[PDB]
Amino acid sequence: GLGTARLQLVEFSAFVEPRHLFVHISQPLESVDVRQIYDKFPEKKGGLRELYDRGPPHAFFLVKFWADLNWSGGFYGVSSQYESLEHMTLTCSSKVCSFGKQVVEKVETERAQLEDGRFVYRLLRSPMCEYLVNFLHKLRQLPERYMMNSVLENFTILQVVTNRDTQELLLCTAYVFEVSTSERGAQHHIYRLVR
Amino acid sequence: AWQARGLGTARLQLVEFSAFVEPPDAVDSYQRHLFVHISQHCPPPLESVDVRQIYDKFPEKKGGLRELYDRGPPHAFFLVKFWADLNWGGFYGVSSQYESLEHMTLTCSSKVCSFGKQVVEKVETERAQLEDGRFVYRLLRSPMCEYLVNFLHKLRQLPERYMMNSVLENFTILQVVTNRDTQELLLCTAYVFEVSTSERGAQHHIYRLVR
Ligand SMILES: *CCC(=O)Nc1cccc(Nc2cccc(OCCCCC)c2)c1
Numbered sequence: 187g188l189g190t191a192r193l194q195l196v197e198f199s200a201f202v203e204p205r206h207l208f209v210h211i212s213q214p215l216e217s218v219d220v221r222q223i224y225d226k227f228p229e230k231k232g233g234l235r236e237l238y239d240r241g242p243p244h245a246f247f248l249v250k251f252w253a254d255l256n257w258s259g260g261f262y263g264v265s266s267q268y269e270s271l272e273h274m275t276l277t278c279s280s281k282v283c284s285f286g287k288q289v290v291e292k293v294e295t296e297r298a299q300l301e302d303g304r305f306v307y308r309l310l311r312s313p314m315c316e317y318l319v320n321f322l323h324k325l326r327q328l329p330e331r332y333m334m335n336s337v338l339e340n341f342t343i344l345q346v347v348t349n350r351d352t353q354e355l356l357l358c359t360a361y362v363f364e365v366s367t368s369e370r371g372a373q374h375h376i377y378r379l380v381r
Numbered sequence: 382a383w384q385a386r387g388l389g390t391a392r393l394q395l396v397e398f399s400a401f402v403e404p405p406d407a408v409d410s411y412q413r414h415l416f417v418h419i420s421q422h423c424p425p426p427l428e429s430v431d432v433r434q435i436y437d438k439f440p441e442k443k444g445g446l447r448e449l450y451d452r453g454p455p456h457a458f459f460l461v462k463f464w465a466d467l468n469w470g471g472f473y474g475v476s477s478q479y480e481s482l483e484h485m486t487l488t489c490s491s492k493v494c495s496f497g498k499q500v501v502e503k504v505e506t507e508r509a510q511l512e513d514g515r516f517v518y519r520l521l522r523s524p525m526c527e528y529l530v531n532f533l534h535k536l537r538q539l540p541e542r543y544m545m546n547s548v549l550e551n552f553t554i555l556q557v558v559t560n561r562d563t564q565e566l567l568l569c570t571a572y573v574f575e576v577s578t579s580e581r582g583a584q585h586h587i588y589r590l591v592r
């Protein structure tokens with residue numbers, strides 16, 4: 187699963203409704219060397235290189251998305267649902283990167299809620315960046331999915347989830363993107379990152 | 382009249398804004414340099430500028446001035462013209478404080494734009510802190526992201542003020558403060574820039590954006 191003893195992703199969708207899901211995770215994982223994807227994110231402070239060093243290594247995951255772009259709007263949303271057995275306040279940083287430069291950093295806070303003898307963190311129907319909405323509307327124009335893939339090889343997201351009070355890193359997920367077909371809806375493959 | 386006297390509405394007032402750098406020496410004898418600074422501690426109607434005149438200086442489609450102005454409310458839109466002081470490996474930071482009569486979760490987006498295209502964007506949320514009968518939203522000492530720090534380091538090495546001014550002619554910043562829960566826009570500030578002259582520190586002029 188995508189998670190640690192301390193925090194687990196329970197669900198993630200980005201979608202549009204005027205529900206079409208561009209990407210959806212509902213909840214022995216393969217390994218990939220983090221060195222392979224250093225040049226996908228900025229090398230300054232808050233870079234994958236210097237984040238993995240600080241540890242803990244077991245908290246770093248890669249998610250590859252085959253996004254469904256078959257659907258001017260519209261409400262454009264992200265929904266995330268995390269859970270834990272300990273009571274925490276989360277800070278969720280999302281850095282949208284184009285050619286390894288950060289073009290958007292979005293910083294959210296979510297306080298734990300008690301539900302069925304576990305703590306849930308609901309960041310539901312958060313409005314998508316104006317930048318992603320515009321990018322999506324242009325991406326959908328492209329005549330060929332090989333062109334959509336060419337444009338996405340340079341487009342990445344890094345989401346760092348911290349224990350607010352302690353600053354302890356809990357989850358670091360790198361996201362990479364291609365496009366799926368219609369008959370073959372959104373798909374993903376979650377990997378663990380190792381050095 | 383109900384025309385703004387400062388940068389704020391009845392729902393949300395800027396208290397203080399500043400971009401600064403603290404030299405490494407700051408730990409020994411404290412000092413900070415203000416690139417720009419707005420203080421509305423203790424206060425005539427503001428002047429008006431037609432938002433159409435600056436459309437092409439900001440991004441387009443979703444979250445471009447024209448669409449933001451279209452969604453409204455029209456009284457929440459301001460233009461700040463900064464004369465930045467560029468005469469100073471330190472700490473580059475941004476501090477903002479807003480006040481409200483009501484309890485809200487604010488979302489704050491800052492969009493750095495070059496020739497009118499979005500380049501770099503920072504989005505933060507701040508929950509209300511209830512103090513002396515009113516709520517305060519404090520976003521103090523946000524690290525300046527590395528694009529603005531590289532930009533400042535380059536701009537300051539230019540041989541001539543007129544060249545700094547020509548570069549800054551195509552450098553703008555759009556700030557949208559929304560009620561995170563309801564999505565209603567509270568405050569939209571467009572920033573245009575020039576250099577000030579070494580002996581004059583940072584200065585600013587605030588305008589109402591009209592149409
Ligand atoms: C570098 C991207 C980023 O994070 N920018 C950022 C972050 C928080 C707040 C702001 N706002 C802002 C608004 C007006 C002026 C500012 O700096 C002035 C320096 C430029 C003078 C030439 C910053 C931006």
Ligand SMILES: *C(=O)CCCCCCCCCCCCC
Nearest residue numbers: 200208253264280292314315363
């Ligand atoms: C910006 O508003 C922050 C959003 C951060 C999470 C985005 C998750 C991925 C978006 C899915 C759509 C991309 C398909 C190419």
